[PDB]
């Protein structure tokens, strides 16, 4: 979906900076393995933020 | 800041060509005529200030010198890197197949 939006932006004139600058942070953040729930461990306790950190 | 000296060396001509000052001896197998006799001699008589200096190794037959000449475009020289040359690593660097 991120690739589609970037291709559309471009198809319609945007620079590469603009096209990517148009991607919502929230969408990008989903496209990150730190949010994939199959990456944990049984004894790795607490919030996700306790592993990779609090995303800024 | 701390640097891995081997990774750095891959950014120099050592990453492109056979370096007469550092490269393990098995690399000489990549060209006709170098291994084992010239390779032994090149490594034993290193380091070299320039590539051409390889021609000044004492005791070389004429065809030996000629083989050197034909392969100079495949050679380079950089500073002796201690991590590549210690431990007899030029002779056996722990890599087989």
């Amino acid at each position: 979906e991120i690739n589609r939006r970037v291709q559309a932006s471009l198809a319609s004139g945007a620079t590469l900076e603009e096209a990517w600058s148009a991607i919502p942070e929230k969408l990008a953040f989903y496209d990150y393995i730190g949010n994939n729930p199959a990456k944990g461990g049984l004894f790795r306790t607490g919030p996700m933020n306790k592993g990779d950190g609090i995303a800024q | 800041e701390l640097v891995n000296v081997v990774d750095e060396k891959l950014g120099t001509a050592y990453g492109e060509k056979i370096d007469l000052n550092n490269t393990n001896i098995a690399a000489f197998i990549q060209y006709r005529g170098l291994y084992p006799t010239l390779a032994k001699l090149i490594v034993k008589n290193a380091p070299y200030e320039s590539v051409e200096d390889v021609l000044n190794i004492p005791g070389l037959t004429e065809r030996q010198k000629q083989i050197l000449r034909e392969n100079l475009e495949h050679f380079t020289v950089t500073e002796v890197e201690t991590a590549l040359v210690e431990g007899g690593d030029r002779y056996n660097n722990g890599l087989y197949k």
Partner: protein, 243 residues
């Protein structure tokens, strides 16, 4: 004489040859002949490690250590040219031999100190005008001490210089900078210093024997920590030959 089966398992294989108490002679040097040391042997009898104090106003002493790697310490079959110099001094230039042993000693309290005990690339000299080698002759020189581990050595998490991972792969998202010293392996090359004090000479044979003391740095674990200063003492033996 003694064969391998006489010696095997006794400890003697780690002992440098000794000279009789009559070996007090003089080995003449002809500035026109070239010579070599055909066999240099160094047997350590004491390893001392310099303590590292909390304040650098206290005098730091070399303290005794306990050897934990058994009788695997002696350097032997070392050889190289013995040059006669302009001023009549002699210079030994090491060419080859069994010229290093990894050694681990333990401080009181149990801290283990690995070191590469060595005289690699030794260039050692006497005082000038040495017309004969006598029990008054000394050699003093310097040598190289390369990293205790060579470049392929992988730490327990697989990280290395010429091989291995370049990060702490078990901490996929930890910050890199605090771990840089652990992650980026480095290969030290330092200098050590040695003195050989002749105490016995067989002029009839070219054999000499005496005491030595050297100083060098210990293992820095490929850059991960600061090495300690070591002082090695023992006996030596050498056979000189016209060559």
């Amino acid at each position: 004489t003694l064969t391998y089966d006489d010696i095997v398992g006794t400890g003697l294989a780690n002992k440098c040859p000794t000279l009789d108490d009559t070996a007090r002679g003089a080995y003449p040097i002809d500035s026109s002949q070239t010579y070599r040391i055909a066999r240099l042997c160094l047997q350590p009898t004491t390893f001392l490690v310099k303590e590292e104090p909390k304040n650098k106003r206290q005098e730091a002493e070399f303290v005794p250590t306990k050897l934990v790697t058994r009788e695997t310490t002696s350097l032997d079959q070392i050889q190289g040219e013995l040059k006669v110099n302009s001023d009549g001094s002699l210079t030994f230039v090491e060419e080859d031999g069994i010229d290093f042993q990894p050694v681990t000693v333990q401080m009181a309290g149990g801290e283990r100190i690995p070191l590469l005990f060595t005289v690699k690339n030794l260039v050692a000299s006497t005082q000038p005008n040495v017309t004969s080698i006598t029990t008054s002759t000394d050699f003093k020189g310097e040598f190289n001490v390369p990293s205790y581990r060579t470049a392929n050595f992988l730490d327990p998490k697989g990280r290395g210089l010429a091989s291995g991972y370049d990060s702490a792969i078990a901490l996929p998202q930890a910050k890199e900078e605090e771990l840089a010293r652990a992650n980026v392996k480095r290969f030290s090359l330092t200098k050590g210093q040695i003195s050989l004090n002749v105490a016995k000479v067989d002029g009839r044979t070219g054999e000499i024997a005496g005491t030595f003391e050297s100083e060098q740095l210990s293992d820095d674990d490929m850059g991960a920590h600061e090495p300690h200063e070591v002082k090695i003492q023992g006996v030596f033996y050498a056979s000189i030959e016209p060559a």
